Amino acid sequence: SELLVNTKSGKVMGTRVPVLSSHISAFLGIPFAEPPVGNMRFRRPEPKKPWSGVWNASTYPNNCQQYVDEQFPGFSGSEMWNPNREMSEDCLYLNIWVPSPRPKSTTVMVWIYGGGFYSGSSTLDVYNGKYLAYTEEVVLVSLSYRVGAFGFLALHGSQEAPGNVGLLDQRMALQWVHDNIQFFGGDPKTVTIFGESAGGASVGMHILSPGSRDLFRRAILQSGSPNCPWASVSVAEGRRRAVELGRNLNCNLNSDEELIHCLREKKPQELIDVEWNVLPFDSIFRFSFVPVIDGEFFPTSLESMLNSGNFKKTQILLGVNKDEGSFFLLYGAPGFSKDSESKISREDFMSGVKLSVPHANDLGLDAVTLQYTDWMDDNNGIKNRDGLDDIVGDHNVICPLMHFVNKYTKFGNGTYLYFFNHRASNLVWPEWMGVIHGYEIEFVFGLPLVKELNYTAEEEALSRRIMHYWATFAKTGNPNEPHSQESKWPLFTTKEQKFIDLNTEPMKVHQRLRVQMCVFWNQFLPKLLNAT
Amino acid sequence: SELLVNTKSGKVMGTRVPVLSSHISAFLGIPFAEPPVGNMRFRRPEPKKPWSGVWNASTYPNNCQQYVDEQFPGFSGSEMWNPNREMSEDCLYLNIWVPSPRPKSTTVMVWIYGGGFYSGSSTLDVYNGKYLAYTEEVVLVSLSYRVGAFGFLALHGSQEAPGNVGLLDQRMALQWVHDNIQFFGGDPKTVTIFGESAGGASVGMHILSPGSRDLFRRAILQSGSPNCPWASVSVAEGRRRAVELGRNLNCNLNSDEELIHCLREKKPQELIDVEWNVLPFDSIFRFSFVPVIDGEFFPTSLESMLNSGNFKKTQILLGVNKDEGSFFLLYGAPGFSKDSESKISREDFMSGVKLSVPHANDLGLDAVTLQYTDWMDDNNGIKNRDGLDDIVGDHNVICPLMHFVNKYTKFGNGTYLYFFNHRASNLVWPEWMGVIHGYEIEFVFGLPLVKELNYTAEEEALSRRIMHYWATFAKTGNPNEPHSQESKWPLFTTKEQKFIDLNTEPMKVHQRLRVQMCVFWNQFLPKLLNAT
Ligand SMILES: *[C@@H]1O[C@H](CO)[C@@H](O[C@@H]2O[C@H](CO)[C@@H](O[C@@H]3O[C@H](CO)[C@@H](O)[C@H](O[C@H]4O[C@H](CO)[C@@H](O)[C@H](O)[C@@H]4O)[C@@H]3O)[C@H](O)[C@H]2NC(C)=O)[C@H](O)[C@H]1NC(C)=O
Ligand SMILES: *[C@@H]1O[C@H](CO)[C@@H](O[C@@H]2O[C@H](CO)[C@@H](O[C@@H]3O[C@H](CO)[C@@H](O)[C@H](O[C@H]4O[C@H](CO)[C@@H](O)[C@H](O)[C@@H]4O)[C@@H]3O)[C@H](O)[C@H]2NC(C)=O)[C@H](O)[C@H]1NC(C)=O
Ligand SMILES: *[C@@H]1O[C@H](CO)[C@@H](O[C@@H]2O[C@H](CO)[C@@H](O[C@@H]3O[C@H](CO)[C@@H](O)[C@H](O[C@H]4O[C@H](CO)[C@@H](O)[C@H](O)[C@@H]4O)[C@@H]3O)[C@H](O)[C@H]2NC(C)=O)[C@H](O)[C@H]1NC(C)=O
Ligand SMILES: *[C@@H]1O[C@H](CO)[C@@H](O[C@@H]2O[C@H](CO)[C@@H](O[C@@H]3O[C@H](CO)[C@@H](O)[C@H](O[C@H]4O[C@H](CO)[C@@H](O)[C@H](O)[C@@H]4O)[C@@H]3O)[C@H](O)[C@H]2NC(C)=O)[C@H](O)[C@H]1NC(C)=O
Ligand SMILES: COc1cc2c(cc1OC)C(=O)/C(=C/C1CCN(Cc3ccccc3)CC1)C2
Ligand SMILES: COc1cc2c(cc1OC)C(=O)/C(=C/C1CCN(Cc3ccccc3)CC1)C2
Ligand SMILES: *[C@@H]1O[C@H](CO[C@@H]2O[C@@H](C)[C@@H](O)[C@@H](O)[C@@H]2O)[C@@H](O)[C@H](O)[C@H]1NC(C)=O
Ligand SMILES: *[C@@H]1O[C@H](CO[C@@H]2O[C@@H](C)[C@@H](O)[C@@H](O)[C@@H]2O)[C@@H](O)[C@H](O)[C@H]1NC(C)=O
């Protein structure tokens, strides 16, 4: 049967699912590791022991234990990101959508969710793979991985909580796909990994990590890059946070073994309740338990790896949304609210600046302020608001990505860069937030093709075009149809630095994406903070 | 007789001079101090001993000993600034132009020449007072003062070369005018002092200095302000330069008395030949012998005087030209030449930056570079050229003036600010230099009213208008005619910071003159250089 697939871990049975007037097969909730429970909490994942019988893969798995947003109860704009299944530490599963009839050897795309390394779920409506799998004839996988302290608590030197285990979860799922996707009709030599935000950083981290590179062919990074200032900590900062987490739960702190034992006795919600207490600064766009630069997953600093070409050389497609900062200001900074235009006073601007760049001395804060203030009109509330939005977006997403892309392109085999600046017509967040972090994802997974969801015809066309770029890139390493009459997305090269806008208008090509602001964040400010 | 005037120093006889189809009287070369020669070299000036007989004041006096520009021999653009009389240490004289018939009590305007404190002459064609005196019915005085080491050599603690004597020269001429201008028909209570560049700084310095303030009523500063980074040095830096000057001339350096004695034996040209050797940095827009912050002429630092309101409170009219930097780049920086468009390579840009801000550490140089580079187009030769022109103008003239004007306005009794951006149609310097430092002076002295000099009709009108603003300001403290139908130059206030463009087009009013760049030079960069 089409819904029966025999794999090297055992048989699995999927389910036929309707999609846009047709059908495909879905295999939901396949386990790829042993449940990381009890004394395995905080440990490297172990491969799932093979099963006899037929593994029922007709329904979505549990989501990993995580912080749940309750800021806007019942509001679809926030709740679209929250877990839509029960949470459990028993959450290492993946999902596969397969065209019908079963292909023989087709391009595979593996989705790595974002969520700041502290949240996220493979089961969200907006990550449903059926539209993309159906429309573009790809086998679409979404994996899962431990987040929060369960994924990232790091006591370097210990084997019981080494750190990075959530990244090892992702890698184990990609090993599973490498080993098994052939039985589903996928081609294991044309596996493209793709992700957004922390998921994009994660993609980058597998490009870098020697122990993951061989498992995939090429890569798409959306609004995230491995060098983002929020995406990793040093082993000392990681240890500090794990000890502070212990302090918050009245743990014995005298040794790794005492702390870990104490942390493993706690219910998952107890860790989540105090997780945000361990951050060293009052800050926005900063998460507590993130990847650690350990010497093992990452053999040296990310900057030395990037500079020396210590990474997988392949093709990458990547980009950013216009207003990356807005979500984090809404949730994290004074004077930004959901139902107000959120015009900002000089005083909320200056506070915002300090929250945005937590590691900065006063001179550094004055440099950032100068760089984004219009001194002809320094009391404009709108300008102050948009200015902070740009500070946050630039520092945390756009400029780290630009630096990644410039470094990667020197050694890699083909780079395509985009700037997504179309605000969805049915966006339920306010207008001041603009083209918000995350809101390209619906276009990439083809939601606008569904009439009920209330997108325009032009948004449908934009989504079709995005999907086809993403899938043709995954198939061939180039998002353009070799002999199309359609306008061509050119390659980003070192010299010319080209990129395209992705929106409903005819394709425009530009050069040197936010270069003015990125020289400030990537070259001048770090030099400034180093000299003081 | 009209050409005979009896003064408290003695009688003087002037000469009738033709001007624009009419005539006025001129009294040229009146002495105001004893010749500062022999053992009086470097000393405070002494008042001229009164004379019997009639002092022949029919011809211009000698110019003070100074460096003479030979870079473009015979070229009118440079030679218009060089001494047009014989040079002599016997050079403390003034010139007076008086309407005909002799007025009873009319507004007096006293011109203080520029020249970087190392050069300048009261006798230049472009400073001829006859047009202004005639057209606006003012008594026009131009004074002179010692420049170079003769005016500014400073060995603080010594009475033989205290420093600032060139400023005491100016003050002695203003004392003379205060005491005597009544005999010429001038009103000693409506004396306006005005000057350009070093002359403008000098005006500012008399506003500040307690020992000069009572001698005049109000003030005009053109492209110069007392706080300019080139216009003064500390007593330690002054001493250092006077000792280095001595080193250059194989002087005994063991005491002030040995050094000064040695320096007084030298011919004037020997000092001038090595004067530029004493500058501490490789720099542009920096002159060797300038005013010293001594505790006496200036009782405390210029910034504390400005902050505390320790200055004369009156009305001031002041402004800048659009391309103040260009002259100094031409003369001082590699890649700028007179007969080339002077497009500048990245490497000549970076060199230029370092010459422009000599006191700056590397981080400071990177800050200035960032502030003026368009990173979308960083190899444009034109942009690099114009960018350096702006750096030089901003740092040295515009931003110090903006800071002066903002500080002064808090305590003063009325401020009028202009931005002169009309390039003379007959300018003989190249186009790349734009609206060059010094080239408003011809409009202020009414040269465009003279047909032979080849200005347009619109330039004539612009000059008439400028002259009438300057003279009505001197008369009343307000450059506008109380009940004119003409457009009004508004007052610069603390809150609104208004200014006007001076050019051939209908008056436009704007606010916050180069505020973006001036926050950088006036607030951020100094903070940066202080923290390193
Ligand atoms: C991604 O990587 C692929 C695969 O590595 C890479 O394709 C390579 O491109 C180069 C062209 O730069 C090819 O090298 C040429 O091969 C031919 C015949 O095989 C030679 O005769 C060529 O030499 C001539 O031309 C040279 C100019 O580059 C001269 O230097 C020389 O003196 C000769 O006149 C030349 O070596 C190479 O074979 C391909 N390989 C394949 C399989 O296509 C591709 O360009 C990379 N893409 C990106 C965006 O980086
Ligand atoms: C696509 O667009 C359509 C067309 O606009 C849209 O349908 C609308 O959806 C909302 C669903 O929430 C409907 O609003 C409800 O209407 C009923 C009946 O009048 C009310 O009882 C509801 O009020 C309850 O809930 C409120 C808000 O949650 C509370 O504040 C209140 O106390 C009640 O508890 C509620 O207002 C609306 O009627 C339709 N509009 C039309 C014209 O049909 C659809 O949802 C969009 N589709 C998608 C997938 O987004
Ligand atoms: C330059 O300096 C001149 C001279 O010093 C200065 O002119 C002064 O302006 C003020 C107006 O601010 C005058 O003060 C007023 O005088 C009248 C009558 O003599 C008083 O009745 C006034 O009091 C009323 O209004 C006040 C509002 O300012 C209220 O505070 C008060 O309660 C009353 O209702 C007031 O004190 C002052 O007399 C003049 N002096 C002269 C000679 O004009 C001028 O404004 C300065 N110019 C600039 C640009 O700074
Ligand atoms: C106002 O504009 C008028 C009209 O253009 C202008 O008159 C011009 O002035 C210059 C004065 O230098 C004249 O040029 C000279 O002409 C004679 C005769 O043809 C030549 O012998 C001269 O050559 C000598 O000097 C040269 C440059 O200095 C040397 O390079 C050469 O070897 C010779 O030594 C010289 O070229 C020119 O003739 C007139 N033009 C006209 C049309 O009358 C006037 O000067 C302007 N007025 C002011 C005050 O600027
Ligand atoms: C409980 O404390 C915090 C919670 C949050 C933030 C900060 C917090 O404390 C400093 C924050 O910035 C937050 C930002 C939003 C990021 C974007 N997500 C939605 C999203 C998820 C995955 C990929 C794209 C968008 C909503 C929360 C949430
Ligand atoms: C001999 O050495 C130098 C000579 C000069 C400069 C620099 C020098 O060495 C560092 C300089 O900047 C110079 C600039 C110019 C300033 C503007 N003047 C004309 C002018 C004089 C008074 C008022 C306005 C303009 C011409 C020379 C001249
Ligand atoms: C496979 O699963 C289908 C849906 O299962 C649902 O969730 C699981 C955990 C059970 O609790 C089940 O009763 C729920 O309906 C079933 O409809 C289907 O019968 C199952 N098929 C087989 C062969 O087990
Ligand atoms: C006053 O001066 C006029 C111009 O003087 C000129 O320069 C002086 C220094 C003398 O050298 C003189 O011969 C030059 O002509 C004379 O024309 C005029 O005669 C003088 N008048 C009197 C009364 O001395």
Numbering used by the authors:
A (entry chain A), B (entry chain A): 4 to 535
Would you copy out the relevant sentences from the publication that reported this structure?
The ring nitrogen is engaged in an in-line H-bond with water W850 in TcAChE-1 and W750 in TcAChE-2. The carbonyl function on the indanone is not in direct contact with the protein, but in the TcAChE–DNP and TcAChE-1 complexes, water molecules W1254 and W708, respectively, appear to make a structurally conserved water-bridged contact with the main chain NH of Phe288. The average distances between the closest indanone and Trp indole aromatic carbons are 4.1 Å and 4.2 Å in TcAChE-1 and in TcAChE-2, respectively, while the same distance averages to 3.7 Å in TcAChE-DNP. Although 1 and 2 share a similar interaction with the TcAChE active site, the presence of a second methoxy substituent on the indanone moiety of 1, as in DNP, allows a better stacking against Trp279 accounting therefore for its slightly higher inhibitory potency compared to 2, being the Ki values of 11.12 ± 2.88 nM versus 29.86 ± 1.12 nM. In more detail, the methoxy substituent at position 5 of the indanone ring of the 5,6-dimethoxy compound 1 stacks on the benzene ring of Trp279 at a distance of 3.9 Å. The binding of 1 displaces 8 of the conserved water molecules (W742, W749, W795, W628, W625, W678, W679, W767) in the native not inhibited TcAChE crystal structure and one new molecule (W874) is stabilized. Overall, according to the crystallographic structures, the binding of 1 displaces from the TcAChE gorge a larger number of solvent molecule than DNP, i.e. 7 versus 3. The rigidity introduced by the double C–C bond compels the indanone moiety of 1 and 2 to a somewhat less effective interaction with the peripheral anionic binding site residue Trp279 at the entrance of the catalytic gorge if compared to the TcAChE–DNP complex.
Acetylcholinesterase inhibitors were introduced for the symptomatic treatment of Alzheimer’s disease (AD). The X-ray crystal structures of Torpedo californica AChE in complex with two novel rigid DNP-like analogs, compounds 1 and 2, have been determined. Compounds 1 and 2 are rigid DNP derivatives synthesized by using an innovative eco-friendly synthetic procedure. Both molecules have been selected as promising candidates for the development of drugs with dual activity on AChE and BACE-1.40 The C–C double bond that in both ligands links the indanone core to the N-benzyl piperidine moiety lower the flexibility of the molecules compared to DNP. The N-benzylpiperidine moiety adopts an almost identical position/orientation within the enzyme catalytic gorge in the crystal structures of the three TcAChE–ligand complexes.
